[PDB]
Amino acid sequence: ASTKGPSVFPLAPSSKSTSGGTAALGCLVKKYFPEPVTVSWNSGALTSGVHTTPAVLQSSGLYSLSSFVTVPSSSLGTQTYICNVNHKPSNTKVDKKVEPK
Amino acid sequence: QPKAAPSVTLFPPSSEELQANDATLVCFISDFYPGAVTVAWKADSSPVKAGVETTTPSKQSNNKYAASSYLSLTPEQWKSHRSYSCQVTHEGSTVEKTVAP
Numbered sequence: 001a002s003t004k005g006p007s008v009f010p011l012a013p014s015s016k017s018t019s020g021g022t023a024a025l026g027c028l029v030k031k032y033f034p035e036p037v038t039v040s041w042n043s044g045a046l047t048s049g050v051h052t053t054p055a056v057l058q059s060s061g062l063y064s065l066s067s068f069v070t071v072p073s074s075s076l077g078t079q080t081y082i083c084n085v086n087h088k089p090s091n092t093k094v095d096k097k098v099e100p101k
Numbered sequence: 102q103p104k105a106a107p108s109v110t111l112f113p114p115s116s117e118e119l120q121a122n123d124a125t126l127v128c129f130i131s132d133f134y135p136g137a138v139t140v141a142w143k144a145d146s147s148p149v150k151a152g153v154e155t156t157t158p159s160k161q162s163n164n165k166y167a168a169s170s171y172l173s174l175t176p177e178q179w180k181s182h183r184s185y186s187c188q189v190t191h192e193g194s195t196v197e198k199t200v201a202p
Contacts, residue, residue: 011112011127016200024110028118028127051131051161053169056154064154066169068110068129 004062005092006032008085011066014101018073025098026068027083031060032090039067040084076100104192105165107133111187111198114179124179126200128170128187132163139190140170143197144182 011017011026018024029037039052052067067083077100085094107130114124130138136158142149152173158166170187179185180202188197 007121009115009118009125011129012115017110017112019108024129026112026127026129028115028125030118030123030125051129051167053129053156053167054159056156056169056171058154064171065156066127066129066171068131068167070131 001089002033003090004031004033005090006030006037006085006087006094008083008094008096010096010098011068012098012101013071013076021073022070023073023076024068024070025081026066027085027096027098028064028066029085030064031062032064032087033062034089035063037063037065038086041067041069042080042082043084046081102134102164105132105134106194107131107138107189107191107196109187109189109196109198111200113200113202114174114176119176119179122176124174124176126172126174126185126187128172128189128198129167130170130189131167132165133158133191134165135192136160136166137191138168141188141190142170142172143186143188145184
C-alpha cells in the first residue's frame with residue numbers, strides 16, 4: 001500500500017505562549033498517509049495537560065494533526081520536552097525535542 | 102455541565118518549517134464547553150479564508166473540548182504582513198490572539 005511518513009515540527013514555548021506562569025508547547029505532525037498517528041510526550045512520562053487533536057484531511061489527500069501540553073513556565077529550559085510520534089503504516093517513529101524559542 | 106470559555110494560544114511557523122520552505126500557523130483552542138466554536142483568521146486586519154483548516158472539537162479527559170485551527174501560508178506570505186491573528190468565537194465571547202514575523 002502507498003504510505004507517506006509525517007514531518008514533525010516543534011511548537012516552541014515562549015513568553016507569547018505563556019499566561020500566568022503556565023506555558024503551552026506542542027508538535028505539529030504534517031502531511032502523512034494513511035491514518036492513524038499516535039503521539040506521546042517524554043515516552044509516556046508526561047500525561048498531565050496533554051491534548052492531541054483529531055487529524056485534518058487536506059485536498060492533497062494527506063493528513064495533519066497537532067499535540068500540545070501545558071507546563072509550568074519555571075520548568076522551561078530545565079525539563080526536556082520530547083514529542084513521540086508513531087506512524088505504524090509507514091513503520092516510522094519520530095521524536096522531536098521542543099525547546100524554548 | 103458548567104460553561105467554560107476557551108484558552109487560545111497561537112503558534113507562529115517554526116524556524117524549522119520555514120527553512121523547509123513552508124509555513125503553518127497553529128491556533129490551539131482548549132478547555133471549552135459546550136463544544137461549539139467558530140474560528141476566523143486575519144492577516145493584519147483583513148479576514149482570510151484561503152489555507153484554513155479546523156478540527157472538529159473533541160472531548161478531553163477533563164470533559165471539556167479542544168480543537169486546532171491551521172493557516173497554511175508560504176514563507177513569503179508570512180514575512181510580508183505585520184501580523185496574523187486567530188479569532189475564536191464561543192457562547193457570546195470572541196477571543197483573538199496575534200503573532201508577528
